[PDB]
Amino acid sequence: KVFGRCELAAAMKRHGLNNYRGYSLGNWVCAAKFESNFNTQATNRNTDGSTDYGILQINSRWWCNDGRTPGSRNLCNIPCSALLSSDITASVNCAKKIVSDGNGMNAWVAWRNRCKGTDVQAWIRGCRL
């Protein structure tokens, strides 16, 4: 499913992402925009053979099992396909563990490169939250 901006903002808020670990909602919405373009079915393969899955492009080498990434750790204990569902719950729960990993949102390269230090507030502007 391809979420609309405010729709995703509201769903993420309901799932406890607004200000989780100090990151305002605008950061999470900005990250989804640049990571998947709000599309839950987005996948991208990396050169190391691992694959990024879903709305937040979570990596198979550490967070989920896709049965084809040798040495994968499956820290969120879920098959990677669960991260592509229209219900963002699995994605959100796993993202919570990732952002708590000690490196914050820098774990998401698109966030670091395109959201970090920008007026992330613009991403939730106009939304009924």
Curated annotation (Swiss-Prot):
Key word Cell division present: no
Disulphide-bonded residues: C6-C127, C30-C115, C64-C80, C76-C94
Tissue specificity of this protein: In the egg white and polymorphonuclear leukocytes.
The entry's keywords: Allergen, Antimicrobial, Bacteriolytic enzyme, Disulfide bond, Glycosidase, Hydrolase, Secreted, Signal
Database matches in InterPro entries: Glyco_hydro_22, Glyco_hydro_22_CS, Glyco_hydro_22_lys, Lysozyme-like_dom_sf
PROSITE patterns named among the record's database cross-references: GLYCOSYL_HYDROL_F22_1, GLYCOSYL_HYDROL_F22_2
E.C. designation(s): 3.2.1.17
SMART domains xrefs: LYZ1
Active-site residues from the entry: E35, D52
Reaction(s) catalysed by this chain's protein: Hydrolysis of (1->4)-beta-linkages between N-acetylmuramic acid and N-acetyl-D-glucosamine residues in a peptidoglycan and between N-acetyl-D-glucosamine residues in chitodextrins
Subunit description: Monomer.
Misc. comment: Lysozyme C is capable of both hydrolysis and transglycosylation; it also shows a slight esterase activity. It acts rapidly on both peptide-substituted and unsubstituted peptidoglycan, and slowly on chitin oligosaccharides.
Record protein name field: Lysozyme C
Gene that encodes the chain: LYZ
